[PDB]
Design a protein around this ligand. Structure first.
Ligand SMILES: Nc1ncnc2c1ncn2[C@@H]1O[C@H](COP(=O)(O)OP(=O)(O)NP(=O)(O)O)[C@@H](O)[C@H]1O
Ligand SMILES: Nc1ncnc2c1ncn2[C@@H]1O[C@H](COP(=O)(O)OP(=O)(O)NP(=O)(O)O)[C@@H](O)[C@H]1O
Ligand SMILES: Nc1ncnc2c1ncn2[C@@H]1O[C@H](COP(=O)(O)OP(=O)(O)NP(=O)(O)O)[C@@H](O)[C@H]1O
Ligand SMILES: Nc1ncnc2c1ncn2[C@@H]1O[C@H](COP(=O)(O)OP(=O)(O)NP(=O)(O)O)[C@@H](O)[C@H]1O
Ligand SMILES: Nc1ncnc2c1ncn2[C@@H]1O[C@H](COP(=O)(O)OP(=O)(O)O)[C@@H](O)[C@H]1O
Ligand SMILES: [Mg+2]
Ligand SMILES: [Mg+2]
Ligand SMILES: [Mg+2]
Ligand SMILES: [Mg+2]
Ligand SMILES: [Mg+2]
Lengths: 285, 244, 261, 94, 125, 102, 327, 197, 217
């Protein structure tokens, strides 16, 4: 019952995901379309850790945390993962679900562990995937279990402000909706870089995506590569992917591994529903 | 259907203070600031517009300072739609009294009747009450300049300075330190524009977000002259005072 | 218990669509790799009550012989928080050993819905579970030889997130059986019952037109009971006919019949 | 919130425009000097509501200069820095 | 037989600002797009006017209507509300206008009359 | 934020260093100081700055002490704070706790 | 409990109970159940007693001397304090008068109302005159998370008081317990409920304690789940009004004697010039004078400081108020 | 008690609110012991009072999740055995409200009479005031009915309280004979205070 | 647990349909639904049609719903498990749902049994569309109930009877025809059944000709 040897602080890590933090893919569609946003994330996140030297000479403080918000199906949690994986700086990947607890004071003790754990093993990358759930519009205590959600939340704010001017990139967090967040508390200076993800896209932005698709299996010579490009007019990557998935399924039946240009045409055409014009036009038109 | 459901605004409140009237003061303070400064020789009246949109032709459209007649001008803060009805009602009332008696209506009489209409709405009108405060800058020979303001309550109170709209306290506090009883109209022009800029979050309150009017007896041969100042005239006096 | 693959039959095509998604990439991941696409995954089932959606979820499972996890998600919510986070996480991981495995998420609506999250902490939990379920499907690692079928049935709690383009090859709507989709169902049903040979089924279907599957089963249960009260080892063709008159009226009067995006 | 029970209550005002200038000054010294003194130009443009807003300008100004590898902090750098920051604040607070 | 309401359904929200005004506005936003550029030698007004059903006559559908032979108008929002408001506006202008003037109403004037009517709807239980 | 800076020296520095002087000119001593204002004012940065010059043990206790569970329940450890602060004086107990738990 | 047969039922730190033998030393009589007792560890037998509820609670509760406050040093609310004396003090000093009327003596008072009136103080004052053994306890101690310790302690209060009758039990911050319920999932409806119960079961008790007065200082009885048993057993209830004009003269007089050279400004005219306020707000004002003297580096407090102090103090209270507009 | 004395049936008093004997059916032991002895005595009454606690309805439905009480209760049903002949042994149960009691107990057999006691009329409340007031020395000629008139409908505890306070105010003035005046003052005081809650 | 024990077996001896007063129609329907398929069970099996699952009973309180069921249970020699829905409902959202599932697993051991569940007024109607949904307790347990009723799992042998006061109150998805078998409404006393109902109650007390039953009706 005596101290015979010591452990790293690194030993006995906080409750954390069974599989890899590390991303097994490097092929990346993260490159091919939203490429402009992929560079931006690199700028805030890759550029200080890799080149410390640059920063020291100008004299700046290490760039501030990064909030990622946009509509979901823009691959937010995947564009940043890719970078962590290939930079090969330490990556701690946690969820609000890890933190959540049924007990009394059990959430916060994990939270203190994350911040310190990052400092120990610096340069270090903190990404909390679920943060939406944790943030509330208004605080409550109507049941006893609301108060627990509230404990995690406050303990997180205090330390987040205090993580400023570490070497370690500040907490990167992702949110599908930001009406859950309160704007005064969570705010620039913690989080001066706030990335908007578009969804209007461009003729060139879409083109990048089609190239990644096309490499996988040579498009039939029934009609040109350039056909796919014309039919999309503003749609985002997420839909592009649903299109290409159906198309090659039907391709397998015919016994050709080439996806026909007809198939993509039919798959594109469909998915038109999304509350028609009848309902609207009887009292909004 | 209609029996079951209720949206009675004509309950006698248990606090002595009708709840609907409470919320209409909140709504007033969202709308821009209007300032009445009463001097011995006039009323200097000035109100900032609350729009700031660039496509919107603010220049042309006066939306707060409306000339009722020669001696009486009103500044509006509150709901602009509700306000329009009371402008026509206030215009016709001064004309009818002028016709009957051949004297411009004393200020007191006009303000009282309009306040009593607001009152009426919650007395037994069934109506939601108009959520507007008006500063009635008025003159009559007997009583000199007279300055009164109205409340959504249907209560008026006289003053030597008043503020409505936003920054009621910020404006009121400056005027108390800087305005003295004896400052003339001339001073009050310089005073008004500068305090407004200092309350508002704008770096310089532009001439195009301003409306300015004066009612003065220092218009020769014992006469009363009003002039709603045009946006470019506001600009020259804006440059003098160094706001721009 | 197993559901005979002859047994299900009533909307052919509709059934063929579930096998393309599931059956094909389990037996051959090779084909999907040769093409290069991400193999087909995610199935969204919606339809009325009684339509045979559980019968269908079961049917695919028996056919392949792939291990089966039948979980209502009314059985994963609990009074204290974060129990739910554990329940799905263990179950997804459990299925991986038992590959091929299909996790039947019955009444996904339960843990569905948007907004909420301001009442009891149980409302915040609902959303939490939905969010983590998505992250496991895609955004963490990809779906292997374990596939997930989502069934829903209440339109009130719906999510644009589970409807969104991405995972899903097929967004499957399961409507009222066909004119002879109902016949096919009728046929199975008259085989089992003892009869003196009854060929009144053509008429019986004219009345019992636009019937959901549940009512095809019900007309045979009510009439056969009438045969047994009448002291017979035979459902007479008279008895089968009488039954469809009675059910037809009370069917349409009380129809719940829900449809979902 | 009984009075004299918490015996002192302190409010910190939202910063003055002069108050802002003092914060802006000291962090610029840590970076490199603003050429053609455009420390005033920022303060004349907007008053922050917090010292975080001030910090945000600094970091950004030093960021355009970093890319270039020209230590100078030019008027061009400041002007970008401010507008970029100014947009962001408006899109949260609308 | 009149509804037993005797009071304004429209209440101030407890945070100020009428519930119903907010409620009405959403419709305008939801409805289809209209644009206009004021010009020195004219005004262009433009709107989308999609076929309701190809079988439907797409010529009889209108969103441009006349108030005076000089002044025309287009809207966005509820279609049936527009039609009635136009009819009221023809009477409010024309007859009364001719009696006190005997011309076509200038634009400034016409626009102000319309504003009061919208207010009186809301105020009225 | 110049006003706040000057002011805070009077409120904190003097009751520790000269309890007798702070009493004589004034009367007795405070029951404490409550700091509030826009987040991002750097209120935190002010408390820590004074604390340097005062020269005391600046112990941040952030939050509920229901997080502590080392020995006993964490509930009464809140209460027990008084005892421990006394022993470990000189001390500035910086009780941060927003009280947004419901 | 003791079973007369030289056995006892004891609980130790360890969780199971023990049917133990008493072995010599302390006699059964000289023991009191509810006491903390000495056990020999190898074989658990009562080898004595010396501990006698060795516990911080015992420390806080006991006060054998009379309180530090002597009577109507406190200035104003005279009549109020001469109501608490009719009910409490008067029957202990003379029950004779009550017997002769043919009426039970009043027992109990409940002090309720509002912060700032120095409620707590009045209780100490009345008790000192009586020179009753005046136990005093904080309510926060009787409630704790640990299970079943709460009723032991609560029962003990009642036993100690009856022995030392004539007695006053002052239970301060009874309002603390209220209907605060640790965790609203579950719990707080077990331990808390049990402690409340015990106090009441002993109130009237198995022994007649009408010679134990009780004084409960509280915001309201509506904070607590109401249950205060026997109304005429808590008898008269005392509603504190806040100081009025005459009251605050006296209370002022104490405070201004601390501020150096404020004697110059006539006691009466200080009263007049300020707005009617409570004695609490005098405490705020007196503090304001010294606060201003500190900013100024006013070397000695002056007549000018005390006058300036009025205006800033009055200004604070108005500012804090919210103008909702009297219509 | 009054009917006990007249009928010449003996009386056993048990109060389960006072009794703290309930821990996971300690109270089961307890109900079993007294009830069983009592059936044995011919010509007796068993009054278990405030069965609201101890023997109480389960609170498993509510937030606490307590079920100590459900044990003492379980025991109490099997003893009754619906209606059972006992030989003129009266089983008395007192609740604050019958509604709170467990629905299995409420069913018939077990409970053969139910009776609501309510606050009485002015003539009865004059009578309850009368008894207490008599016991104390008072200036005679007193109209009992006058004091009751002012008081709204009220509990018997309130009536004892008015005589106590009245007693005291006379002693304060050194009258050893409480006048009518004191009863007027006493009423105002207790009424004003309590009522407003 | 002691909770479980209480629900379990509390079969009292018969009372016999002879002592339910008037209301012929109700009885006829109940005996067909239930009793003939237990005794004639062999034909039901052979045809391979499912034997009838349940009886739904609704109407006035005080129409002998209880009485009726209990008589049926003993005649078939099935045990009368007595359940009531407000009991299984708790403030504990987790635990109160758990019990519903637990009750059915217990029934299988005791087969044959007739499950009488009462007062599904407790699980009301489900028409929610707004944010406040009853905080998922009413919703939760409706869809729970249906998973026991589910016919792939045994619920054809063992029957579910239910009583609950009007069907307007009950939610639309578990009120489907052929789900809870027949739905039998209780018509009121009609000055026929009244006279009987009284007659049987007076049989216990002394019977005299001074009393006139018909007048009372
Ligand atoms: N570089 C990218 N550009 C465009 N879309 C992307 C990109 N990467 C992935 N996607 C698509 O985004 C879909 C979902 O990716 P995912 O990681 O779930 O996104 P998200 O925006 O974080 N939202 P959520 O699922 O609500 O967390 C995929 O099915 C892809 O089609
Ligand atoms: N395609 C089919 N072939 C054969 N029988 C079918 C078929 N489709 C539906 N059925 C019948 O429909 C009956 C009842 O359906 P059921 O299992 O109650 O449906 P569900 O839609 O999963 N409902 P629930 O969970 O009760 O909302 C089955 O037992 C079958 O007899
Ligand atoms: N006056 C300042 N000058 C420069 N940067 C500042 C200033 N004040 C704050 N900051 C920055 O803004 C960040 C957020 O402020 P923070 O330190 O959380 O302040 P606070 O006002 O004590 N907050 P809170 O306790 O959450 O109400 C700090 O980490 C600094 O980087
Ligand atoms: N007659 C009085 N007796 C005692 N203090 C009084 C009297 N009248 C006014 N006071 C003032 O009240 C101050 C003390 O009141 P205080 O101790 O704060 O309150 P309490 O009523 O016991 N409340 P709480 O703070 O809830 O315990 C004194 O220092 C006086 O300034
Ligand atoms: N049909 C009837 N025949 C005789 N007595 C009846 C009849 N219906 C009800 N009762 C009497 O009234 C009581 C209440 O009926 P119960 O069966 O508990 O009703 P429900 O379940 O319909 O609410 C019975 O216990 C019985 O004494
Ligand atoms: Mg994501
Ligand atoms: Mg199903
Ligand atoms: Mg801080
Ligand atoms: Mg006190
Ligand atoms: Mg019943």
């Amino acid at each position: 019952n005596a101290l015979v040897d010591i452990l790293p602080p690194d030993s006995d890590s906080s409750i954390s995901v069974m599989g890899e933090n590390e991303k097994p893919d490097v092929t990346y569609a993260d490159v091919g379309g939203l490429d402009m946003q992929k560079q931006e994330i690199r700028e805030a996140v890759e550029l200080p850790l890799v080149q410390a030297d640059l920063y020291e000479q100008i004299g700046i403080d290490p760039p501030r945390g990064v909030l990622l918000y946009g509509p979901p199906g823009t691959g937010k949690t995947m564009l940043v993962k890719a970078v962590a994986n290939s930079t090969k700086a330490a990556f701690i990947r946690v969820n609000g679900s890890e933190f959540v607890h049924k007990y009394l004071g059990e959430g916060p003790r994990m939270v203190r562990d994350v911040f310190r754990l990052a400092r120990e093993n610096a340069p270090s990358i903190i990404f909390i995937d679920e943060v939406d759930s944790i943030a509330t519009k208004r605080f409550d205590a109507q049941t006893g279990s609301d108060r627990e959600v509230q404990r995690i939340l406050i303990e997180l704010l205090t330390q987040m402000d205090g993580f400023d001017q570490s070497t370690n990139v500040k907490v990167i967090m992702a949110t599908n909706r930001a009406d859950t967040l309160d704007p005064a508390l969570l705010r620039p200076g913690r989080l001066d870089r706030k990335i908007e993800f578009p969804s209007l896209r461009d003729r060139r932005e879409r083109r990048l995506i089609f190239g990644t698709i096309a490499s996988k299996m040579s498009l039939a010579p029934e009609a040109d590569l350039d056909s796919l490009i014309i039919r999309n007019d503003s749609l985002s990557g997420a839909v592009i992917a649903a299109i290409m998935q159906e198309a090659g399924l039907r391709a397998v039946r015919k016994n050709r591994y080439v996806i026909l240009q007809s198939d993509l045409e039919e798959a594109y055409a469909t998915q038109v529903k999304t509350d028609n014009t009848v309902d609207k036009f009887d009292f909004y038109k | 259907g209609s029996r079951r459901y209720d949206s009675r605004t004509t309950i006698f409140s248990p606090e002595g203070r009708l709840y609907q009237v409470e919320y209409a003061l909140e709504s007033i303070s969202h709308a821009g600031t209007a300032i009445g400064i009463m001097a011995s020789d006039g009323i200097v009246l000035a109100a900032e517009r609350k729009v700031t949109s660039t496509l919107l032709e603010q220049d042309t459209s006066t939306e707060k300072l409306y000339k009722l007649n020669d001696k009486i001008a009103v500044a509006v803060a509150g709901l602009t739609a509700d306000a329009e009805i009371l402008i026509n009602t206030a215009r016709i009332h001064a004309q009818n009294y002028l016709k009957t008696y051949n004297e411009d209506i004393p200020v007191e009489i006009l303000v009282r009747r309009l306040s009593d209409i607001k009152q009426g709405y919650t007395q037994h009108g069934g109506l939601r009450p108009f959520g507007v405060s008006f500063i009635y800058a008025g003159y009559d020979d007997r009583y000199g300049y007279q300055l009164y303001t109205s409340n959504p309550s249907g209560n008026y109170t006289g003053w030597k300075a008043i503020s409505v709209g936003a920054n009621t306290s910020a404006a009121q506090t400056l005027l108390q330190m800087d305005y003295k009883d004896d400052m003339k109209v001339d001073d009050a022009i310089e005073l008004a524009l500068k305090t407004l800029s200092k309350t508002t979050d704008s770096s310089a309150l532009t001439y195009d977000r301003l409306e300015f009017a004066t009612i003065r007896k220092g218009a020769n041969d014992g006469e009363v002259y009003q002039k709603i100042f045009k946006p470019q005239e506001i600009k020259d006096i804006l440059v003098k005072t160094g706001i721009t | 218990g197993e559901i005979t693959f002859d047994g299900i039959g009533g909307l052919t095509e509709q059934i063929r669509e579930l096998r393309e998604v599931i059956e094909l990439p389990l037996k051959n991941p090779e084909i999907f790799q040769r093409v290069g696409i991400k193999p087909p995954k995610g199935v969204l089932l919606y339809g009325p009550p009684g339509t045979g959606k559980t019968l269908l979820a079961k049917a695919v499972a028996a056919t392949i012989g792939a291990n089966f996890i039948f979980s209502p998600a009314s059985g994963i919510v609990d009074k204290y928080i974060g129990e739910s986070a554990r329940i799905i996480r263990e179950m997804f991981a459990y299925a991986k050993e038992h590959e091929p495995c299909i996790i039947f998420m019955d009444e996904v609506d339960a843990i569905g819905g948007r907004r909420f999250s301001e009442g009891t902490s149980a409302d915040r939990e609902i959303q939490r579970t939905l969010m983590e379920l998505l992250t496991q499907m895609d955004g963490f690692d990809n779906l292997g030889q374990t596939k997930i079928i989502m069934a829903t049935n209440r339109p009130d709690t719906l999510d644009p997130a589970l409807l969104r383009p991405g995972r899903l090859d097929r967004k499957v709507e399961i409507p009222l059986p066909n004119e002879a989709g109902r016949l096919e169902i009728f046929k199975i049903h008259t085989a089992k019952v003892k009869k003196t040979g009854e060929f009144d089924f053509e008429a019986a279907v004219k009345m019992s037109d636009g019937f959901n599957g549940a009512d095809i089963r019900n007309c045979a249960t009510e009439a056969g009971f009438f045969a047994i009260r009448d002291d017979r080892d035979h459902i007479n063709p008279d008895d089968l006919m009488k039954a469809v008159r009675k059910v037809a009226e009370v069917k349409k009067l009380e129809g719940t019949i829900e449809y979902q995006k | 919130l009984r009075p004299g029970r918490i015996d002192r209550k302190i409010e910190f005002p939202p910063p003055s425009v002069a108050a802002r200038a003092e914060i802006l000054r000291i962090h610029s010294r840590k970076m490199n000097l603003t050429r053609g003194i455009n420390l005033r130009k920022v303060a004349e443009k907007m008053n922050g509501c917090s010292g975080a807003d001030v910090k945000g300008v600094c970091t950004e100004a030093g960021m355009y200069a970093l890319r270039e590898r020209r230590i100078h902090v030019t008027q061009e750098d400041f002007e970008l820095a401010v507008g970029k920051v100014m947009n962001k604040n408006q899109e949260t607070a609308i | 037989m009149t509804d037993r309401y005797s009071f304004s359904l429209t209440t101030f929200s407890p945070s100020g600002k009428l519930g119903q005004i907010d409620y009405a506005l959403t419709a305008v936003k939801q409805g289809v797009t209209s644009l206009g550029i004021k010009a020195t030698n004219g005004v262009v007004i433009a709107t989308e006017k999609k076929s309701s059903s190809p079988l439907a006559m797409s010529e009889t559908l209108s969103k441009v209507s006349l108030l005076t032979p000089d002044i025309g108008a287009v809207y966005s929002g509820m279609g049936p509300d527009y039609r009635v408001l136009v009819d009221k506006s023809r009477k409010v202008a024309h007859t009364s206008y001719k009696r006190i003037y005997g011309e076509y109403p200038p634009t400034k004037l016409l626009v102000s009359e319309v504003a009061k009517i919208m207010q009186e709807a809301t105020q009225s239980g | 934020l110049t006003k706040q800076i000057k002011e805070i020296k009077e409120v904190i520095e003097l009751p520790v260093k000269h309890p007798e002087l702070f009493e004589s000119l004034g009367i007795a001593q405070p029951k404490g100081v409550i700091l509030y204002g826009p987040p991002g004012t750097g209120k935190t940065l002010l408390a820590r700055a004074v604390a340097h010059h005062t020269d005391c043990k600046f112990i941040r206790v952030s939050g509920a002490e229901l997080v502590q569970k080392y020995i006993g329940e964490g509930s009464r450890m809140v209460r027990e704070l008084f005892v421990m602060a006394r022993e470990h004086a000189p001390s500035i107990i910086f009780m941060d706790e927003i009280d947004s738990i419901g | 409990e003791i079973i007369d047969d030289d056995h006892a039922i004891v609980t130790s730190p360890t969780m199971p109970d023990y049917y133990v033998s008493i072995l010599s030393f302390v006699d059964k009589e000289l023991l009191e159940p509810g006491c903390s007792v000495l056990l020999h560890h190898k074989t658990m037998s009562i080898v004595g007693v010396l501990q006698d509820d060795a516990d911080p609670m015992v420390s806080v509760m006991k006060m054998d001397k009379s309180p530090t406050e002597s009577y109507s040093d406190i200035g104003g609310l005279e009549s109020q304090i001469q109501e608490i004396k009719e009910s409490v003090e008067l029957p202990l000093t003379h029950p004779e008068l009550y017997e002769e009327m043919g009426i039970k003596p009043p027992k109990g008072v409940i002090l309720y109302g509002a912060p700032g009136t120095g409620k707590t103080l009045l209780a100490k004052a009345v008790a000192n005159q009586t020179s009753a053994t005046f136990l005093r306890i904080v309510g926060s101690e009787l409630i704790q998370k640990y299970l079943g310790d709460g009723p032991r302690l609560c029962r003990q209060i009642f036993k100690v008081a009856g022995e030392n009758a004539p007695s006053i039990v002052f239970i301060d911050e009874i309002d603390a317990i209220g209907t605060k319920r640790y965790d609203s999932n579950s719990g707080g409806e077990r331990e808390i409920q049990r402690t409340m119960l015990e106090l009441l079961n002993q109130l009237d008790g198995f022994d007649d304690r009408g010679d134990v007065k009780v004084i409960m200082a509280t915001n309201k009885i509506e904070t607590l789940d109401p249950a205060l048993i026997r109304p005429g057993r808590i008898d008269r209830k005392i509603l504190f009004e806040n100081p009025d004009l005459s009251t605050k003269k006296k209370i002022l007089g104490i405070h201004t004697s601390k501020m150096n050279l404020s004697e110059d400004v006539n006691l009466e005219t200080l009263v007049t010039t300020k707005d009617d306020l409570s004695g609490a707000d005098i405490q705020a004002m007196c503090t304001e004078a010294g606060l201003l003297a500190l900013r100024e580096r006013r070397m000695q407090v002056t007549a000018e400081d005390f006058k300036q102090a009025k205006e800033r103090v009055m200004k604070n209270k108005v500012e804090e108020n919210l103008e909702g507009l009297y219509l | 008690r009054a009917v006990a004395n007249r009928t010449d049936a003996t009386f056993i008093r048990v109060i389960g609110s006072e009794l703290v004997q309930k821990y996971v059916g300690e109270g089961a032991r307890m109900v079993r012991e007294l009830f069983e002895m009592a059936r044995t005595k011919k010509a007796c009454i068993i009054f278990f009072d405030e069965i609201d606690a101890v023997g109480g309805a389960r609170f498993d439905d509510g937030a606490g999740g307590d079920n100590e009480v459900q044990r003492t209760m379980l025991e109490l049903i099997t003893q009754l055995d619906g209606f059972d002949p006992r030989g003129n042994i009266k089983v008395m149960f007192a609740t604050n409200r019958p509604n709170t009691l467990d629905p299995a107990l409420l069913r018939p057999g077990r409970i053969d009479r139910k009776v609501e006691f309510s606050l009485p009329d002015l003539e009865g409340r004059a009578n309850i005031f009368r008894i207490h007031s008599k016991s104390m020395s008072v200036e005679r000629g007193i109209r009992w009915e006058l004091i009751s008139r002012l008081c709204p409908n009220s509990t018997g505890a309130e009536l004892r309280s008015v005589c106590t306070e009245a007693g005291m105010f006379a002693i304060r003035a050194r009258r050893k004979v409480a006048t009518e005046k004191d009863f007027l003052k006493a009423v105002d005081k207790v009424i004003s205070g309590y009522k407003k809650f | 647990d002691s909770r479980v024990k209480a629900m379990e077996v509390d079969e009292k001896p018969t009372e016999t349909y002879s002592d339910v007063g008037g209301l012929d129609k109700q009885i006829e329907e109940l005996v067909e639904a239930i009793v003939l398929p237990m005794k004639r069970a062999d034909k039901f099996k052979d045809m391979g049609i499912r034997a009838p699952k349940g009886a739904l009973m609704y109407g006035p309180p005080g129409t002998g719903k209880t009485l009726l069921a209990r008589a049926c249970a003993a005649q078939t020699n099935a045990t009368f498990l007595k359940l009531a829905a407000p009991q299984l409902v708790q403030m504990y959202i987790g635990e109160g749902a758990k019990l519903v599932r637990d009750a059915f697993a217990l029934a299988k051991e005791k087969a044959p049994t007739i499950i009488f569940i009462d007062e599904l007024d407790a699980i009301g109607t489900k028409r929610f569309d707004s944010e406040k949904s009853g905080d998922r307790e009413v919703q939760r347990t409706m869809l729970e109930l249906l998973n026991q009723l589910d016919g792939f799992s045994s619920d054809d042998r063992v029957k579910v009877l239910a009583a609950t006061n009007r069907v307007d109150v009950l939610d639309p998805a578990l009120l489907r025809s052929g789900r809870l078998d027949r739905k039998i409404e209780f018509p009121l006393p009609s000055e026929d059944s009244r006279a009987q109902i009284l007659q049987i109650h007076s049989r216990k007390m002394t019977t005299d000709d001074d009393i006139n039953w018909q007048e009372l009706a």
